[PDB]
Short mmCIF file of all heavy atoms in Angstrom, two decimals:
data_model
loop_
_atom_site.label_atom_id
_atom_site.label_comp_id
_atom_site.label_asym_id
_atom_site.label_seq_id
_atom_site.Cartn_x
_atom_site.Cartn_y
_atom_site.Cartn_z
N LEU F 54 103.96 31.51 93.39
CA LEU F 54 103.45 30.17 93.12
C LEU F 54 103.29 29.83 91.63
O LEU F 54 103.87 28.85 91.14
CB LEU F 54 102.11 29.95 93.83
CG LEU F 54 102.24 28.98 94.99
CD1 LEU F 54 101.35 29.42 96.13
CD2 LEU F 54 101.94 27.58 94.55
N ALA F 55 102.46 30.57 90.93
CA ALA F 55 102.17 30.31 89.52
C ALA F 55 102.61 31.44 88.59
O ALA F 55 102.78 32.58 89.04
CB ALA F 55 100.69 30.03 89.34
N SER F 56 102.85 31.06 87.32
CA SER F 56 103.02 32.00 86.24
C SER F 56 101.68 32.43 85.70
O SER F 56 100.89 31.63 85.21
CB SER F 56 103.89 31.40 85.13
OG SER F 56 105.28 31.49 85.41
N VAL F 57 101.42 33.74 85.75
CA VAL F 57 100.18 34.31 85.23
C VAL F 57 100.41 34.67 83.77
O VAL F 57 100.76 35.79 83.44
CB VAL F 57 99.77 35.56 86.04
CG1 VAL F 57 98.30 35.87 85.83
CG2 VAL F 57 100.04 35.38 87.53
N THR F 58 100.20 33.70 82.86
CA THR F 58 100.54 33.88 81.45
C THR F 58 99.31 34.22 80.60
O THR F 58 98.44 34.95 81.03
CB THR F 58 101.26 32.61 80.87
OG1 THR F 58 100.32 31.80 80.16
CG2 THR F 58 101.92 31.78 81.99
N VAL F 59 99.26 33.66 79.37
CA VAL F 59 98.12 33.95 78.47
C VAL F 59 97.85 32.75 77.53
O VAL F 59 98.66 31.86 77.40
CB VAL F 59 98.37 35.19 77.60
CG1 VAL F 59 97.07 35.80 77.14
CG2 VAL F 59 99.17 36.25 78.38
N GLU F 60 96.66 32.74 76.87
CA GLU F 60 96.42 31.85 75.76
C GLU F 60 96.00 32.63 74.55
O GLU F 60 96.27 32.25 73.44
CB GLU F 60 95.35 30.81 76.08
CG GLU F 60 95.36 29.64 75.12
CD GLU F 60 93.98 29.01 74.93
OE1 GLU F 60 93.61 28.12 75.73
OE2 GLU F 60 93.26 29.38 73.97
N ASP F 61 95.26 33.73 74.78
CA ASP F 61 94.86 34.67 73.72
C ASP F 61 94.33 35.94 74.34
O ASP F 61 94.31 36.06 75.56
CB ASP F 61 93.82 34.01 72.81
CG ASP F 61 92.70 33.36 73.60
OD1 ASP F 61 91.89 34.09 74.18
OD2 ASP F 61 92.65 32.11 73.60
N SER F 62 93.91 36.87 73.52
CA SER F 62 93.39 38.14 74.02
C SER F 62 92.23 37.86 74.98
O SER F 62 92.04 38.62 75.92
CB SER F 62 92.95 39.04 72.87
OG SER F 62 92.48 40.30 73.34
N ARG F 63 91.48 36.78 74.70
CA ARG F 63 90.22 36.52 75.40
C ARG F 63 90.32 35.36 76.39
O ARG F 63 89.30 34.91 76.94
CB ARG F 63 89.11 36.24 74.37
CG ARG F 63 89.04 37.27 73.25
CD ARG F 63 87.61 37.64 72.81
NE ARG F 63 87.62 38.80 71.93
CZ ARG F 63 86.51 39.44 71.53
NH1 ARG F 63 85.33 39.04 71.94
NH2 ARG F 63 86.63 40.50 70.73
N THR F 64 91.53 34.84 76.61
CA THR F 64 91.73 33.81 77.64
C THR F 64 93.08 34.02 78.34
O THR F 64 93.80 34.97 78.00
CB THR F 64 91.68 32.41 77.05
OG1 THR F 64 90.93 32.41 75.83
CG2 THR F 64 91.04 31.42 78.03
N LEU F 65 93.41 33.15 79.28
CA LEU F 65 94.47 33.47 80.19
C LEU F 65 94.89 32.25 80.97
O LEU F 65 94.23 31.82 81.94
CB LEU F 65 94.02 34.60 81.13
CG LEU F 65 94.96 35.25 82.15
CD1 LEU F 65 94.27 36.47 82.78
CD2 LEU F 65 95.47 34.34 83.23
N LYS F 66 95.99 31.63 80.55
CA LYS F 66 96.54 30.42 81.20
C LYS F 66 97.19 30.71 82.54
O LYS F 66 97.76 31.79 82.79
CB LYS F 66 97.57 29.72 80.27
CG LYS F 66 97.01 29.22 78.94
CD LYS F 66 96.47 27.79 79.06
CE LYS F 66 95.93 27.28 77.75
NZ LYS F 66 97.01 27.13 76.73
N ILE F 67 97.12 29.73 83.43
CA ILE F 67 97.78 29.81 84.72
C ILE F 67 98.70 28.60 84.82
O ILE F 67 98.30 27.50 85.18
CB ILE F 67 96.77 29.88 85.87
CG1 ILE F 67 96.30 31.33 86.06
CG2 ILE F 67 97.33 29.36 87.20
CD1 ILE F 67 95.18 31.53 87.06
N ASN F 68 99.98 28.83 84.44
CA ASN F 68 100.99 27.80 84.57
C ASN F 68 101.48 27.81 86.02
O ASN F 68 101.80 28.85 86.56
CB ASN F 68 102.17 28.06 83.61
CG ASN F 68 102.72 26.77 83.01
OD1 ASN F 68 102.74 25.72 83.63
ND2 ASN F 68 103.20 26.87 81.76
N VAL F 69 101.50 26.64 86.64
CA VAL F 69 101.74 26.52 88.06
C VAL F 69 102.85 25.50 88.33
O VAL F 69 103.23 24.72 87.42
CB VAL F 69 100.46 26.09 88.82
CG1 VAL F 69 100.60 26.35 90.29
CG2 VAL F 69 99.26 26.77 88.25
N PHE F 70 103.40 25.52 89.54
CA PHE F 70 104.15 24.37 90.03
C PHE F 70 103.53 23.92 91.35
O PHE F 70 103.34 24.72 92.26
CB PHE F 70 105.64 24.69 90.22
CG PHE F 70 106.50 23.46 90.36
CD1 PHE F 70 107.15 22.90 89.23
CD2 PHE F 70 106.65 22.84 91.58
CE1 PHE F 70 107.94 21.77 89.37
CE2 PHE F 70 107.47 21.71 91.71
CZ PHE F 70 108.10 21.18 90.60
N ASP F 71 103.23 22.60 91.38
CA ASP F 71 102.43 21.90 92.41
C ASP F 71 101.01 21.70 91.87
O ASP F 71 100.38 22.64 91.38
CB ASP F 71 102.39 22.64 93.74
CG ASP F 71 101.58 21.91 94.80
OD1 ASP F 71 101.31 20.70 94.61
OD2 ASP F 71 101.22 22.52 95.82
N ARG F 72 100.52 20.48 91.98
CA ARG F 72 99.15 20.14 91.55
C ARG F 72 98.37 19.49 92.68
O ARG F 72 97.84 18.37 92.55
CB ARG F 72 99.16 19.26 90.31
CG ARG F 72 97.82 19.22 89.59
CD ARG F 72 97.50 20.52 88.86
NE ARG F 72 98.60 20.86 87.94
CZ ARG F 72 98.76 20.27 86.75
NH1 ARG F 72 97.92 19.33 86.34
NH2 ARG F 72 99.76 20.63 85.97
N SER F 73 98.31 20.18 93.82
CA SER F 73 97.48 19.80 94.95
C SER F 73 96.80 21.00 95.57
O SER F 73 96.19 20.91 96.64
CB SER F 73 98.35 19.07 96.00
OG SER F 73 99.51 19.82 96.27
N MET F 74 96.88 22.15 94.89
CA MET F 74 96.25 23.39 95.32
C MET F 74 95.37 23.99 94.23
O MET F 74 94.91 25.12 94.33
CB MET F 74 97.29 24.42 95.74
CG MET F 74 98.03 25.02 94.56
SD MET F 74 99.79 24.99 94.79
CE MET F 74 100.26 25.41 93.13
#
Side-chain angles (χ1 to χ4, degrees):
Chain F
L54 252 143
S56 277
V57 200
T58 99
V59 203
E60 197 209 274
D61 47 72
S62 182
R63 312 219 169 188
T64 336
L65 186 172
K66 296 272 181 65
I67 277 173
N68 219 328
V69 197
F70 196 95
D71 181 16
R72 197 71 56 76
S73 49
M74 74 229 169

